[PDB]
Amino acid sequence: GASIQQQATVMLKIMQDYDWHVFSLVTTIFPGYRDFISFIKTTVDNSFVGWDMQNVITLDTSFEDAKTQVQLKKIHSSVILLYCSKDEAVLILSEARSLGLTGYDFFWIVPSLVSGNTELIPKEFPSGLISVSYDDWDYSLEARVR
Amino acid sequence: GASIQQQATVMLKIMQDYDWHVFSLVTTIFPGYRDFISFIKTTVDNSFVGWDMQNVITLDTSFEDAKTQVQLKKIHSSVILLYCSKDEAVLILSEARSLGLTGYDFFWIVPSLVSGNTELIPKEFPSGLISVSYDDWDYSLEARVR
């Protein structure tokens, strides 16, 4: 399976193939966020697209909805990148749905980390969340061990 | 002394003289609000300024901070107009200070109604509230009766 950087490259490829050149960056206190930030910064500056990046949204704690909502309001793009654990995702998505940022154009992209069990599916995930995970169900574990 | 409409005209003159052309409208359930709304609507449409007006904020009851905060968040202007009694002003101002809308650029304008006793001064009023009242202390009651 792949690391965070390979999946981030795949995500930016997917974004390019649909010409969604305006986005932001939302990161939680989950460890390993700064490496993701640095990889994105290095990837954008050597690209043919010239992406429009809004200022990075960083959470501090479980959002009090007092000063965190101030940063959440300034998110004006259509594509949003989120890097969080599964437990915080339900809270943040309910918060955004209350803020009204859950429109059709407000796409949401998350790595394989937030997509947990296939059976466990929170109701606060809008129908159309963007996720990429290495779980290929066409290839069984027998092929893997072979 | 003057009515609500004359004081509203004076307030809009004050706003024009500082070129604060972006504002909203916050009204409570205090009686006489609809006349103020109609007067403002008629005054703006025949003006040289072309004011930017956000949607009017109307309170329903003592704010539960459940759906009222939804409307309070959408207030994004620098100039805010408030029409309320003195008892509700402390509650609403504490609510806004908790929401963080108590910045230096977030000016607050209120009529003579909310400014009660000169001695009675709540602590929740930020230093710099905008108020206009006909209490002219340079002219005594002797001149008035004369």
Interface of A with B in 37-76 (CB under 8 A): 66-67, 69-70, 73
Radius of gyration of chain A (CA): 16
A98 vs B: CB within 8 A = yes
Assess B98–A contact: CB distance below 8 Å, yes or no: yes
- This structure's resolution (Å) is 6.1
The closest alpha carbon to A2, from A41, A10, A140, belongs to A10
Gap from B114 CA to chain A (nearest CA, Å): 27
Asked whether the beta carbons of A26 and A82 are under 8 A apart, the reply is yes
| Number of Cβ pairs < 8 A linking chain A and chain B | 10
* Bridge pairing between strands B22-27 and B52-58: parallel
What is the spatial distance between Cα A13 and Cα A44, in angstroms, rounded to a whole number?
Answer: 11
Distance CA B28, CA A123 (A): 36
Buried b (16+ CB within 10 A) or exposed e, B89-112: beebbebbeebebeeeebbbbbbe
How far is it, in rounded angstroms, from Cα B97 to Cα B93?
Answer: 6
Is the distance from CB of A84 to CB of A28 less than 8 angstroms? yes
Greatest distance between any 2 Cα atoms in chain B = 54
Longest Cα–Cα distance in chain A:
54
Please give the Cα distance from A109 to B105 (Å, whole number). 35
- The C-alpha angle A81, A66, A75, rounded to 5 degrees, equals 30
Q: Looking at the complex, report in whole angstroms how far the Cα of residue A33 sits from the nearest Cα belonging to chain B.
A: 28
Element (H, E) at B26: strand B22-27
Do strands A107-110 and A79-83 pair parallel, antiparallel, or not at all (unpaired)?
parallel
Q: How far is CA B111 from CA A28, B32, B76, B139, in A?
A: 44, 13, 21, 21
For residue A25, the 8-state DSSP code is: E
Among B73, B77, B95, the strongest candidate for a mutation testing the A interface, having the largest count of A CBs within 10 A, is B73
Which chain A residues are Cβ-neighbours of B73 within 8 angstroms? 69, 73, 99
Q: Residue B25 and residue B23: Cα distance in Å, rounded?
A: 7
Query: Is the Cβ of A99 closer than 8 Å to some Cβ of chain B?
Result: yes
